[model samples]
Target: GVLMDEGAVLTLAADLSSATLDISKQWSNVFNILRENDFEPKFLCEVKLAFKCDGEIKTFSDLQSLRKFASQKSSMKELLKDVLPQK
Candidate 1:
């Protein structure tokens, strides 16, 4: 299991939302094109829920903290750099 300080966890949620939106937008654009050609995107039921932490939660502040942590030490950076060299 991964251990994330409270601050880091908060940051992660924001990053996840941002990244998810960006990728989803791209997919939506492609889907729109398909729809124009008489192809509709498939729909599948998915469950989504958020659990409350047993303590106080700050909104944007927590997200900013998490973003800072990710910028400082995100493993994906190194892995991507190795796999796909800097452009």
Candidate 2:
């Protein structure tokens, strides 16, 4: 006797909406896809997020002025909650 197993690849596409319900549904489906593919799915799953701020301050003196302003506005604190050692 001989036996064989086979599987097929599938894909689903959707658009993102500003509504919270739509975003949650889409996010759930994305995680479901990852689970279906043994957590190591053969898919192009990459994301990047960037944060930017614009100002006319370019030189070191300008930076110092900005720092002085920030210092006057708030108490700066360094959080050492999650420190990881490098190998």
Candidate 3:
């Protein structure tokens, strides 16, 4: 289970709204990540509900792919930029 504060939820939403899901193994971009699962309906889901009106594509993909998509959350991409190799 993931235990994220309100800030954490909102932080993710920032990019979720901008980048539509492509479900490709490109891993060509960077992203902010949460290793745990189940953003409970009480918290995460409620937060997600707020974004329902936003232009999110609601991606469905496997974690094993760990694919990254393009996003306007440039700061997040930069932060994780060093973790993944471009070679």
Model 1, span 29-65: residue lDDT tens = 8888888989877645332223342353423334344
Candidate that scores best on lDDT: 1
Using all chains and alpha carbons, the TM-scores for the candidates as numbered come to 0.27, 0.22, 0.21
Write model 2 residue lDDT over 30-78, tens digit each, in one string: 8788989888644343322222324432222243443544444333212
Worst 10 residues of 1 by lDDT: 45-54
lDDT of each: 0.46, 0.38, 0.36
Task: Please say which candidate is ahead in TM-score: 1 or 3.
Answer: 1
Best-fitting candidate, scored by TM-score = 1
Please report how far candidate 1 places residue 47 from its true position, in Å: 0.2
Ranking by lDDT: 1, 2, 3
Please identify which of the two predictions, 1 or 3, would achieve the higher lDDT against the true structure: 1
**lDDT of model 1 at position 12:** 36
